[PDB]
């Protein structure tokens, strides 16, 4: 029954963001720790995303893109769209349509340096850590910032696994 309301989680997250900003005036630290907790969630979250689909780690990067894409539909019940691949064809752009945590939560223009929902941008980080595929991942257009629809840019950097599943570590 989805056992949650988008509003409910939105309230919890907004209150938490309020809490950090009340803790540290500088948005730099709130961004740091929010990406830290995004990493933290993304490590355990993949343990459930792989509890349903037993996809092989990475045959190709488009497989990773579709995996992370379906992840949000599993959790946040939104379908992102993958596009804008390089001639190198390793990176990509990913579109989040509607963000439950965002829904009518305005941000102070005196707080612009904050990356509000970057937890997801870090969750995939924490996710991509686990499968031994670290990634330079972040946003190029933010529906939060005033852009039309959310758009995160994924630059994969390097692998951590050999012909054995154990891989380098």
């Amino acid at each position: 029954a989805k056992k949650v309301n988008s509003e409910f989680l939105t309230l919890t997250y907004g209150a938490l963001v309020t809490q950090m900003l009340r803790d540290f005036e500088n948005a730099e630290d709130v961004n740091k720790q929010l990406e830290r907790i995004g990493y933290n969630m993304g490590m355990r979250l993949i343990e459930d995303f792989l509890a349903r689909t037993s996809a092989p780690r990475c045959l190709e990067m488009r497989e990773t893109a579709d995996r992370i894409q379906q992840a949000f539909r599993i959790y946040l019940n939104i379908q992102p769209t993958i596009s804008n691949w390089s001639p190198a064809s390793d990176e990509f752009s990913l579109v989040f349509d509607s963000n439950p945590l965002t829904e009518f939560v305005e941000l102070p223009p005196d707080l612009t340096n904050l990356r509000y929902s970057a937890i997801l941008s870090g969750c995939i980080r924490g996710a991509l850590e686990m499968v031994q595929l670290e990634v330079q991942c972040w946003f190029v257009q933010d529906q939060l910032k005033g852009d039309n629809v959310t758009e995160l840019r994924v630059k994969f950097v390097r692998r951590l696994e050999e012909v054995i599943p154990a891989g380098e570590d």
């Binding site: 939105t10 309230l11 907004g14 963001v17 829904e103 009518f104 939560v105 305005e106 941000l107 102070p108």
Partner: protein
Amino acid sequence: MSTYYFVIVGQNDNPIYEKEFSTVNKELRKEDHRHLTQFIAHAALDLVDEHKWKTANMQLKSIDRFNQWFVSAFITASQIRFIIVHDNKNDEGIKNFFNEMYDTYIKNSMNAFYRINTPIKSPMFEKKSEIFGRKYLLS
């Protein structure tokens, strides 16, 4: 005509946010009248306490009188007080007009940045106030 003027009285009884809906005149005297109407917000506060203990509904039509002004009081589940001072009443529309500003204030509520009696600063709510006032009261 009625010199409609809206004011917020917070949970902790401190005033929050005003919004004129009157014709343009006597603005220097309107500053003193704004002091007056904040005092009237306190007086409303006091009376509407017991008067809302008399009832259980959202709208308490009009309570206080000052020989030219009418005071219309709206109570919410947020126990906010939304007050209009106005020479001649327009209550029939403002019942659901208060309901709509209620819904907008809820929108602000989901914005966790806006908090308990935390004074209004968002342009969104200000432009909502402008469009709604030009709709019914300021008209």
